[model samples]
Target: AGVPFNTKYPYGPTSIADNQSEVTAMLKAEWEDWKSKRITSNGAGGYKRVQRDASTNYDTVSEGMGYGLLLAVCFNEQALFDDLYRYVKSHFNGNGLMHWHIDANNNVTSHDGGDGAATDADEDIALALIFADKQWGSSGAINYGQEARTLINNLYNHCVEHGSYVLKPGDRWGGSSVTNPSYFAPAWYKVYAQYTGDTRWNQVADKCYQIVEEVKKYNNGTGLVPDWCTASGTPASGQSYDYKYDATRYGWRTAVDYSWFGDQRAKANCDMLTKFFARDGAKGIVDGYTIQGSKISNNHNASFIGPVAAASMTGYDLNFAKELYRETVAVKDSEYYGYYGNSLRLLTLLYITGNFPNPLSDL
Candidate 1:
């Protein structure tokens, strides 16, 4: 393995060494819960995805597969990673992007009004494949690097608008006219550009940050962005313009760019977000908010905590992140632990504990 799991590598803000055990211990347990409960075996080479409730329709959302692939890479679990990769490839839509959803029997579902691909899932799958190459190498049975190259091209061709360069929310839905701001993953863009030597990927990175400026500016210094927005940063269609679950990811994605490539835009964005949360302290931070700074959620959530805590690594106080970190790991299984929030928890825990690192940076 190139970079073992639990590397415990520190990045921008304070050391997590003192409290790392708390993270690792939870990481182990959560992973077990994720593996046993969330993933089900499909016929032969594929795997199925279910939400964290452990009882649901058992529809395989493409993003859930993406989350599993990323976590598998982090855990250095090749078997699980390979299964996810195969499952993802088996569901490619006409546009060469993975179809957004499938039922337990591997048939596509029309969940969330879209019958095609989601950029976020395809984005994570491509990145995780690259990480696999870096972690386990490509000479094995599965050529992860080559697999990454194909998805990278499909990502550029279908997920990104060739004319305006803004990322589409998916292959079917969202054009340059309407998009999800949370899908603007600049840090992942950085890695994709480096992995493939593609200038278009670099342009995508630039476009994402440009949208970051417009979207956050639309929030008027609250550092909030709409879950979906137009190219000019106005709320898109009838989509929720509030800082709800989807918008919560903006902070973590931005902070990832700061941690990996030291983008000042990323740093500045995180600073604004951290400052917003700091006024209420860690425990007081709520799950939902209006773009103009009104609280919409009275309850706290790990989903919100993880991203904001990661934001503190690049912005405001490190101790504030630690405070959020403590509350984050202590989140029980029953409390708001669905696929979306649970995925955020796993990702931010890796970043907060310094286990999330750029695999291609060495090259």
Candidate 2:
């Protein structure tokens, strides 16, 4: 097993006392708006589903549901969490994973080359179930622990490269040597090992960090990884390797490990990333870049600011972190980029303010 739940874990900022009230108000407003527009009930089973709105073809994606489930648990919205879980369970494929995309009518559709389960969504959903088990025990109508274990086992068996432990993009795609760097969640793997009593997850964690190192090195000092890569950590063909939409999350994901476990590699990665942003200057930040640090688009968006701010939390430099934090909080929320940008903004705020808890901790 891992560290005990009561044991103290390293966190970023200890207090957001100065802006606590403002942040909370904004969070509530955003949550309500998201719930009203993105979430709706399927009249048939009365199960609540999270859709991407008209901007994304009114599609229901596993990514949205996964994010919804995690948000529900973090905010203590158990009822909403349950509804999301029901919808996810109802939509799961035969292998206990959800189809990556569902049309407005709830029919499975091909996305990213196949109608298979997205490893990232399954990872988040399983982690949320573990959090649910901890927060509310296993006595409710849903046996959270049981469901979590099944999903975890399924992921280990199907979604990962057995030898290298690199997580595939989806259960059905991404052949033995392919993977998505954003799907690498070492901290989650650590927790999964403890919760399921499976030491194999420990190996997965180790390999994920190794993969991170390889990705950073392969990018040639850019401090950014591709949206997709090989199991050995090279950029894969036929995939976007630029520091674009999917790559924006590399910072946030790596920083979480630093916050929870104080992993030195996480610190190293964040340090380089923050320095890159610092050189670009807060106002000069762009929305996309080549892995070599070449600017792709001059566009500035919350998608970049939020994750960069979160990445700066890893003990790199408080001044730069605060600069980005202020920039992120100041951005006005809108329906832009569908729900992706807005959701990331809220999540980044939670992490930057230290409001995001370590689910591995005793609740």
lDDT (0-100) at residue 105 of candidate 1?
64
| Per-model TM values vs. the true structure | 0.92, 0.92
lDDT string, candidate 2, 102-134, tens digits: 877777786453368888889989998998888
Give one digit per residue, the lDDT tens place, for model 1 in 1-363: 422243432347533434655656767678787677677775324454433343545567788878888888888789878877777877888878887866666667665644588999899889899889988899987999998999989888888888789899888668667998888888898888878888777788888878868876667797877788888888787888888888888887888888788888888889898988899988887878888889987878766888888888884777677787777776643633466677788788777777778776552
lDDT of model number 1: 0.77
Indicate the worst ten consecutive residues by lDDT in candidate 2.
1-10
As a whole number from 0 to 100, the lDDT of residue 11 in candidate 2 is 64
lDDT of 1 at 185: 86
Off by over 4 Å in 1: 2-11, 14-18, 42-56, 111-114, 333-337
